[PDB]
């Protein structure tokens, strides 16, 4: 199969930077490549068609070129929208071939979390469990390190933490932490905090909820 | 507009087939290639097979012929694929897309998320997450919704019926040992709330689960 | 009446290259893949390509990729190949053939005869063949037409303009070292000759060459 | 490439027989094969289609079968217009390919040939050559030897063949032997003999003329 080599794997850039994307073909695919940009939770969005023709629609920004074997896609004037994945596709041989993709991340200032911590539901409690949720929002870079402190001790067992996707808007990260706990080990204790941990802030965020307080 | 719409996100026992359904409209079916790639989570694009509208034609990847069979309806303008004697490491989502030599893969449907697993499905238990008597004090007030324990993916969740848009966080779902576990966040002036009425809305298509979870300040 | 029409016979000189036509009508011309083929006299047909006319797409026999050359006139419902490079190997006939899901190869064109030479177009000498005095004697004569020493091929032989279709026959042009000679025979009744006039019309394109020759009893 | 044989690459038959011809493939061509019946100076004629599929306008003598690897055209009631080389040819693989052909030929009845000399055209001794022509019209088999003689002796030098093509109506060929001399070595003798030959007539069918006669 002609196999599509990508590079580089992932970029960083500043907005209004210009960017090339390199896609290699094993072999002669002749003008018959094709770019596509992924958006998680989408389906993938064609950019270029044959090489370098340009679509209705799509933001002049982008624009490629090559042939034979050596492509490139040219972003000039990089935007926060352009997160994502960029695929080449091959439609000159069978079977038509993808490349492994490249992620292209964007740079921005510091930011800290807006933290927010949330005590069980009752609805939860009355069937046995308890899950203690705190969201870590809109932060940059994307290292960040969430603790959970029970009536001042830190408890490691029980987190479940999940991240999404940098922002297309603002380029910032957003994470929720849950710990999830039986309502009776709940009921024992009376002070629940989520602290963030990472070198922006002068030291840690903290949020914290009492139990016995309704 | 011209689209391409696919069937639901389906659980299917290791060993059974499905029949998947791509609906198309706003543009000429008769002189549409129609193709099917299969995408794992966070990996590339894997073309499987295409079917030329016109003739019932078709084109197969060797490593999916016997697995895998297109149909066409001309009637109603959908393209059909019958994958067979699935295996777990046929969970993936598939893709059905629409190429003419004029222009390219232009049309894409949404994708539809195939679970092959010996497991039952599992809907979820929706906790509504209100701050306590303590926070908000702000010119903004985060509010969220635990979507817990529910099996298989994906699930949706919406705020307001997609009334509010803005602000809002899904995060992605977290597999523990077999179920998985998701929540949503959503950011409102503190005008909104709690004067008006805030629901998250979550759908399970695999247990024809719905359901609307208002958020209300916790008094207890 | 559906119908694929090529272009004249050609001499060209090695190392050459020609253009070959295909005018086509009767049919649609969008949806026609139209395919060329060489055949060699007394052999099996050699597929070289086809070109979609809808989207001037084409595919090549690998062994006459860098040889050949197809492109179509969708304004005129014409395709052309053209080929280069010419030795003398590439001397055949070759023709052009609509192909479509519907009817296989239903529709041929007469076949384009392409002669690779460095050697000259030579006339040919027509002489008429009266019997003599001492055969005929019947209610049928045989007249005929030598045809000798003429390139390239072919040539064409009619009779009284062609009034005179029964009883004829041209036999195939033999090729003695560099030139060709080809015979005809015409039988009519007694009632016809000698009393009217019985005249052979030989056409050899190559040269622009067009001669009548009457058969008249060989007084001497 | 996908290889076509053919068989038998000869057969002759007598018209109302039924006769079937082969066509197998190196490998599977799906139900992609068609046949073709060619007659000489013409192009290609679409007999079968997809395997078995009829094609309209062609006699329903004519009927294909097979998939995969085994095909075969049957003709029930042979006719004598059905002489011709039969192709069969795959489209199921790039490149197209075809089969080397089966020449079918009808038997018929011996028939001997209407025989005609011709001595060589005043013109053409004018220009010092001369050409005497012989013309073995309507006759069967194919099989039919030509013999000149020159004052009694036989001459082999210099004689040019040529054979029509199976009479349509009839299953009968014509062929032409032109012997060509000299002026010279023509004006040096004065019988000039041409005699067919073939197990048909009780023995040879001669015609003769002596060019001292005018
Ligand atoms: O008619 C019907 N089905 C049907 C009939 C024939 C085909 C083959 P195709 O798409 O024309 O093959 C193309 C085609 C074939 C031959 C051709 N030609 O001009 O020779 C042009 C196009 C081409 C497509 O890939 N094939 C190849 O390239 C092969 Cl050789 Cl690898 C497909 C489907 C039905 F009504 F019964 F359903
Ligand atoms: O767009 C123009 N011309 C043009 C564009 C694309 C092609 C290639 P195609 O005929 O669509 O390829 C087919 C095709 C390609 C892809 C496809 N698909 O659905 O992905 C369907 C059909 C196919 C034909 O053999 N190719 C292959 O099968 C390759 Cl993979 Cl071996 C040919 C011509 C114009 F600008 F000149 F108008």
């Known amino acids: 199969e002609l196999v599509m080599t990508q590079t580089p794997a992932t970029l960083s850039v500043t907005p209004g930077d210009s960017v090339s994307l390199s896609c290699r073909a094993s072999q002669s695919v002749s003008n018959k490549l094709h770019w596509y940009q992924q958006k998680s939770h989408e389906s993938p969005r064609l950019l270029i068609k044959f090489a370098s023709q340009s679509i209705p629609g799509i933001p002049s920004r982008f624009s490629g070129s090559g042939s034979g074997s050596d492509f490139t896609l040219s972003i000039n004037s990089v935007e926060t929208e352009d997160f994502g994945i960029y695929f080449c596709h091959q439609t000159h041989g069978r079977p038509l071939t993808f490349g492994a993709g490249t992620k292209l991340e964007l740079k921005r200032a510091d930011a800290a979390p807006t933290v927010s911590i949330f005590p069980p539901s009752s609805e939860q409690l009355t069937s046995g469990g308890a899950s203690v949720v705190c969201f870590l929002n809109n932060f940059y870079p994307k290292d960040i390190n969430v603790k959970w402190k029970i009536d001042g001790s830190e408890r490691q067992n029980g987190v479940l933490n999940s991240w999404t996707d940098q922002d297309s808007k603002d380029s910032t990260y957003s994470m929720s932490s849950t710990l999830t706990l039986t309502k009776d080990e709940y009921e024992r204790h009376n002070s629940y905090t989520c602290e963030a941990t990472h070198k922006t802030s002068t030291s840690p965020i903290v949020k914290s909820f009492n139990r016995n307080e309704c | 507009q011209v689209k391409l719409l696919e069937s639901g996100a389906v659980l299917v026992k290791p060993g059974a087939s499905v029949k998947l359904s791509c609906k198309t409209s706003?543009?000429?079916?008769?002189?549409?290639?129609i193709n099917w790639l299969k995408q794992k989570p966070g990996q590339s694009l894997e073309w499987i097979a295409w079917?030329?509208?016109?003739?019932?034609?078709?084109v197969y990847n060797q490593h999916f012929t016997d697995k895998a069979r297109l149909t066409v309806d001309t009637s109603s303008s959908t393209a059909y694929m019958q994958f067979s004697s699935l295996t777990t490491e046929d969970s993936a989502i598939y893709y059905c897309?629409?190429?003419?030599?004029?222009?390219?893969?232009?049309?894409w449907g949404q994708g539809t998320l195939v679970t092959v697993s010996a497991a039952k499905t599992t809907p979820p238990s929706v906790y509504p997450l209100a701050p306590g008597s303590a926070a908000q004090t702000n010119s903004m007030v985060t509010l969220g919704c635990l979507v817990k324990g529910y099996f298989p993916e994906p699930v949706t969740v919406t705020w307001n019926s997609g009334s509010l848009s803005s602000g809002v966080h899904t995060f992605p779902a977290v597999l523990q040992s077999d179920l998985y576990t998701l929540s949503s966040s959503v950011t409102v002036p503190s005008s909104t709330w709690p004067s008006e009425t805030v629901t998250c809305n979550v759908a399970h298509p695999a247990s024809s689960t719905k359901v609307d979870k208002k958020i209300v300040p916790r008094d207890c | 009446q559906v119908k694929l029409l090529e272009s004249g016979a050609v001499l060209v000189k090695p190392g050459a290259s020609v253009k070959l036509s295909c005018?086509?009508?009767?049919?649609?011309?969008?949806?026609?893949?139209?395919?060329?083929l060489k055949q060699k006299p007394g052999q099996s047909l050699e597929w070289?390509?086809?070109?979609?006319?809808?989207?001037?797409?084409?595919?090549?026999?690998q062994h006459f990729t860098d040889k050949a050359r197809l492109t179509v006139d969708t304004s005129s419902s014409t395709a052309y190949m053209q080929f280069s490079s010419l030795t003398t190997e590439d001397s055949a006939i070759?023709?052009?053939?609509?192909?479509?899901?519907?009817?296989?190869?239903?529709?041929?064109?007469?076949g384009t005869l392409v002669t690779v030479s460095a050697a000259k177009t030579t006339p040919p000498s027509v002489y008429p063949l009266a019997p003599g005095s001492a055969a005929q004697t019947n209610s049928m004569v045989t007249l005929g037409c030598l045809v000798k020493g003429y390139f390239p091929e072919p040539v064409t032989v009619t009779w009284n303009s062609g009034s005179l279709s029964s009883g004829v026959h041209t036999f195939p042009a033999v090729l003695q070292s560099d030139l060709y000679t080809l015979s005809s025979s015409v039988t009519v009744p007694s009632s016809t000759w000698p009393s009217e006039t019985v005249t052979c019309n030989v056409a050899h394109p190559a040269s622009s060459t067009k001669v009548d020759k009457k058969i008249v009893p060989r007084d001497c | 490439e996908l290889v076509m044989t053919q068989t038998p690459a000869t057969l002759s038959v007598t018209p109302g027989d039924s006769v079937s011809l082969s066509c197998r493939a190196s490998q599977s061509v799906s139900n992609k094969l068609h046949w073709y019946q060619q007659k000489s100076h013409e192009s290609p004629r679409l007999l079968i289609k997809f395997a078995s599929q009829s094609i309209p306008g062609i006699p329903s003598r004519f009927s294909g079968s097979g998939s995969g690897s085994d095909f075969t055209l049957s003709i029930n009631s042979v006719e004598t217009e059905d002489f011709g080389i039969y192709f069969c040819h795959q489209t199921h693989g790039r490149p197209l390919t075809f089969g080397a052909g089966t020449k079918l030929e009808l038997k018929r009845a011996d028939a001997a040939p209407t025989v005609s000399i011709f001595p060589p055209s005043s013109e053409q001794l004018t220009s010092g050559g001369a050409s005497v022509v012989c013309f073995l019209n309507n006759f069967y088999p194919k099989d039919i030897n030509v013999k000149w003689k020159i004052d009694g002796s036989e001459r082999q030098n210099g004689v040019l063949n040529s054979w029509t093509d199976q009479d349509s109506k009839d299953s009968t060929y014509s062929m032409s032997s032109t012997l060509t001399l000299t002026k010279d070595e023509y004006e040096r003798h004065n019988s000039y003999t041409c005699e067919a030959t073939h197990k048909t007539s009780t023995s040879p069918i001669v015609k003769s003329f002596n060019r001292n006669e005018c």
């Open positions: 897309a629409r190429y003419r030599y004029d222009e390219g893969f232009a049309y």
């Open positions: 706003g543009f000429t079916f008769s002189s549409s290639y």
């Open positions: 079917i030329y509208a016109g003739s019932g034609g078709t």
